Amino acid sequence: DRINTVRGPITISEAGFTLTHEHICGSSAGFLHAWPEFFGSRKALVEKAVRGLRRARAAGVRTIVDVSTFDCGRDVSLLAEVSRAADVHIVAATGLWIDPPLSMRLRSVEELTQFFLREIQYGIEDTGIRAGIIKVATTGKATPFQELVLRAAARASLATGVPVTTHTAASQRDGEQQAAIFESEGLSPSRVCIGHSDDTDDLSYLTALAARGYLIGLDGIPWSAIGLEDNASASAILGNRSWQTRALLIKALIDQGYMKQILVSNDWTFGFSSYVTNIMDVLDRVNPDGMAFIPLRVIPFLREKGVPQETLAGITVTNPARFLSPT
Amino acid sequence: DRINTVRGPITISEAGFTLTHEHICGSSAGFLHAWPEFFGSRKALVEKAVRGLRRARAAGVRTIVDVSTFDCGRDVSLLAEVSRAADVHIVAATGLWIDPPLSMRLRSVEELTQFFLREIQYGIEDTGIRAGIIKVATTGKATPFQELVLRAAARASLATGVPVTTHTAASQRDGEQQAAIFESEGLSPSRVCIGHSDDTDDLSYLTALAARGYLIGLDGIPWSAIASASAILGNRSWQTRALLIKALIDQGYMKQILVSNDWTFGFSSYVTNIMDVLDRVNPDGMAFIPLRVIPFLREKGVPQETLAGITVTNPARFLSPT
Ligand SMILES: CP(=O)(O)OC1CCCCC1
Ligand SMILES: CP(=O)(O)OC1CCCCC1
Numbered sequence: 001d002r003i004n005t006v007r008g009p010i011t012i013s014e015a016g017f018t019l020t021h022e023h024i025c026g027s028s029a030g031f032l033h034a035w036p037e038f039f040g041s042r043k044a045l046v047e048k049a050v051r052g053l054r055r056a057r058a059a060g061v062r063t064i065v066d067v068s069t070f071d072c073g074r075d076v077s078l079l080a081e082v083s084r085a086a087d088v089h090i091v092a093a094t095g096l097w098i099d100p101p102l103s104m105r106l107r108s109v110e111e112l113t114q115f116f117l118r119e120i121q122y123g124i125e126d127t128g129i130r131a132g133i134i135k136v137a138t139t140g141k142a143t144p145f146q147e148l149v150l151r152a153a154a155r156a157s158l159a160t161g162v163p164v165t166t167h168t169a170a171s172q173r174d175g176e177q178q179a180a181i182f183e184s185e186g187l188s189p190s191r192v193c194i195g196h197s198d199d200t201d202d203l204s205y206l207t208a209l210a211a212r213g214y215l216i217g218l219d220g221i222p223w224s225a226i227g228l229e230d231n232a233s234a235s236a237i238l239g240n241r242s243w244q245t246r247a248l249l250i251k252a253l254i255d256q257g258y259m260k261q262i263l264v265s266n267d268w269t270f271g272f273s274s275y276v277t278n279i280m281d282v283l284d285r286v287n288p289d290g291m292a293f294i295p296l297r298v299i300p301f302l303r304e305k306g307v308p309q310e311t312l313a314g315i316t317v318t319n320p321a322r323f324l325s326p327t
Numbered sequence: 328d329r330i331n332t333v334r335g336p337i338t339i340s341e342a343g344f345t346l347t348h349e350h351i352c353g354s355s356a357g358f359l360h361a362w363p364e365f366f367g368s369r370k371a372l373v374e375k376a377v378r379g380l381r382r383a384r385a386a387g388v389r390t391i392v393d394v395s396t397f398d399c400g401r402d403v404s405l406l407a408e409v410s411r412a413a414d415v416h417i418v419a420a421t422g423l424w425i426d427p428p429l430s431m432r433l434r435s436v437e438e439l440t441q442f443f444l445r446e447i448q449y450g451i452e453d454t455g456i457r458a459g460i461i462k463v464a465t466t467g468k469a470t471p472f473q474e475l476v477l478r479a480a481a482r483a484s485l486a487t488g489v490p491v492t493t494h495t496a497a498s499q500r501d502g503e504q505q506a507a508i509f510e511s512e513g514l515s516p517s518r519v520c521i522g523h524s525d526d527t528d529d530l531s532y533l534t535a536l537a538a539r540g541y542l543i544g545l546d547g548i549p550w551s552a553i554a555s556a557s558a559i560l561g562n563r564s565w566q567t568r569a570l571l572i573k574a575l576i577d578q579g580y581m582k583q584i585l586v587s588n589d590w591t592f593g594f595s596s597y598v599t600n601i602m603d604v605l606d607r608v609n610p611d612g613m614a615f616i617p618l619r620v621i622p623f624l625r626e627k628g629v630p631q632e633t634l635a636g637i638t639v640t641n642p643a644r645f646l647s648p649t
C-alpha cells in the first residue's frame with residue numbers, strides 16, 4: 001500500500017512498466033458530463049479507452065499515470081471504469097493545467113494548497129479516489145497565478161510526499177523558472193518531473209536540470225506531423241520533428257550518465273476536446289499504436305541503437321517507481 | 328405543460344410571479360462537485376439556498392429563472408433539490424457566459440448549436456432536466472467567439488421557441504450589436520431580453536431597443552456600493568436603477584420590462600468571502616424585488632395591475648415556447 005490508484009492503494013512492485021504522462025480524455029471541467037455526444041457517446045469513449053489500454057497491456061504496460069487535472073477535464077469515475085475493465089493501474093492527478101476557470105484563478109496560494117491536499121488526502125469529488133501526482137503548467141514566462149500554483153503544488157508535495165509533474169514550453173526553457181520556484185519553497189528536485197522535455201533538442205538545458213536531480217519527462221515520443229504538414233492545426237500541436245529525433249534524446253541522456261533521471265511516455269489520449277474538432281482522427285492515423293507506441297516501437301529502436309535491456313527496464317520500471325513512491 | 332422547469336413541465340398559469348435573471352450558485356463547471364468545502368459544504372449551500380428561496384416565496388415569488396450556464400457552474404441536481412424543498416419553480420438555462428473553457432471556445436457555430444439544442448431538447452447532463460432559456464454574453468465589442476455564441480443561441484431559439492437572455496456591458500451599449508446579430512439570424516426581438524440594462528442611465532438606448540420589440544432586463548436593482556466590491560456593484564443607488572422601470576412604463580413600454588435581482592447564494596467566480604459583503608448590502612436577497620422595489624413603484628404612482636403585468640404576464644409570455 002504505497003501508491004494511490006483509481007482502484008485503491010497498490011504496492012511499488014505491482015506498478016511494473018509505467019507510462020508517466022498519459023490521458024484517458026483531454027477535456028475541460030464538466031465537459032464529458034454535459035456533452036458526451038461530442039465523443040460519440042460516453043460508452044463509445046469507454047470502449048475505445050478499454051481497447052487501447054488492453055492493447056497497451058498486451059505490449060507490456062502495467063501502469064499509466066493520467067496527468068489530467070480538474071481543468072483538463074479529469075473524470076475519475078471514467079478513469080476507474082476503464083482501469084478495472086482493462087486491468088491496468090491508473091494513477092490520478094491533482095493540480096491545475098493551462099485552462100483554469102475563474103473559481104480557480106481567483107484563489108490564493110493557501111486555498112490552492114487546500115484543494116490539492118484535499119484531492120490527495122481525502123479524495124477527488126465524492127469518489128474517495130485519491131491523487132498520486134500533482135500536475136502543474138507554464139507556457140513561457142509564468143503568469144502571477146501560475147506562480148501560486150507551482151508554490152501550492154510544492155507545499156502539497158512537502159506535506160504528503162506526492163510527486164509533482166509539469167507541462168512546459170520546452171523551447172522557452174520553462175523548466176528553469178519552475179525549478180527556481182519549487183526550490184524557493186524547499187521542494188527536493190527528486191520529487192519533480194519537468195515534462196514535455198522532448199519538445200526541444202537543447203541538450204544543455206536537459207542535462208543541467210538532470211544534474212540537479214530533476215526527472216526529465218521525454219513524454220511525447222509519437223508526436224510528429226511529418227507527411228501531413230499542410231494542416232496548420234495538426235502541425236502546431238504535433239511539431240515537425242520525427243519520433244526518432246525525440247527518441248534519440250533518451251539515448252543522449254543515458255550516454256551522458258543520466259539514465260536514472262529519465263521518464264518516458266506517449267502523452268496519448270482516447271478523447272480530445274480541448275483542441276480543434278476531429279484532432280483525435282488525425283492523431284490515431286499518425287500513431288495507430290497509441291499508448292503501445294513506447295514498448296512496441298521505441299524500446300526495440302533503442303535496442304537497435306545499442307542501449308542495454310537493463311537500463312531500458314530501469315527507465316520504464318525503476319525510475320517511475322522511485323518517482324511515484326511517497327517520500 | 329409548456330415551460331420546462333427542473334422538476335418537469337408546468338403551464339403558464341403555474342408560473343405566477345417570476346424573477347427572470349437569478350442564480351442559485353455562481354461557480355465554474357465541475358467546481359461545486361470537486362470542491363464543496365469552498366462553500367462550507369454542499370449541505371450548507373443547499374440550506375442557504377432553500378431558506379433564501381422560501382423567503383422569496385413568502386414575499387410572493389413562485390418561479391425564478393436560474394440563468395447559470397455550463398461555464399457559470401450550473402448544477403441542475405442542486406437546482407432540483409432546492410426547488411423541491413422550497414416549493415419554488417426553477418427554470419434552468421443553456422448557453423455560455425463570460426468564462427468558456429477551451430473545449431467550448433474552440434467550437435464552431437454548428438457545434439455550439441448542437442450543444443444548446445441538446446440541453447433544451449434531450450436534457451442537461453444525465454438528469455433529463457431540460458433548459459427553458461438560453462443565456463449569452465458580451466463584455467463590450469463582441470469577440471469573434473462571442474459572435475458565434477450569439478448566432479448559435481439564435482439558431483437554438485428558432486428551432487425550439489425557447490427565449491434568449493443576455494448579459495451586457497450596458498455602459499458600452501452592447502445591446503445594439505447583440506440586436507444586429509440576432510436580427511441577421513432571423514430571430515424575433517420578442518424572443519430576446521437585453522439584460523443588465525439597469526447598469527446605465529442612458530434612457531435613449533433603452534427606449535430605442537424597446538420600440539424594436541426587445542425585452543429590457545432591469546435585473547440588478549440591489550447591486551449598489553454607496554476594493555473589488557466597488558468594481559462589480561457600482562456607485563449608483565437602487566432607487567436610480569428602480570426609477571428606470573417607471574421611466575420605461577411612462578414611455579409606453581410596460582410590456583417590454585422584465586425585473587429581477589441577479590442574486591446568488593454561492594459565489595466562487597470572484598474574490599473569497601464576497602458573499603459576506605453581498606449579504607450585508609442586501610439582506611433581503613431574492614425577495615428584494617417584491618419587498619422593496621414594488622412598494623417603491625407603488626409610492627411613485629404606478630398601479631398594481633401594470634406591476635402585476637411586469638412580474639407575472641411579461642415573464643410568462645417571454646418564457647412560453649413560441
Ligand atoms: C498540451 P498537452 O499535450 O499536455 O494536453 C493534451 C490534452 C489532451 C490529450 C493530449 C495532450
Ligand atoms: C456579472 P454576473 O451577472 O454574471 O454576476 C453573477 C453574480 C451571481 C453569481 C454569478 C455571477
Ligand SMILES: [Co+2]
Nearest residue numbers: 021023067267
Ligand atoms: Co499531457
Ligand SMILES: [Co+2]
Nearest residue numbers: 493494495523
Ligand atoms: Co451577467
Ligand SMILES: [Co+2]
Nearest residue numbers: 348350394589
Ligand atoms: Co446573472
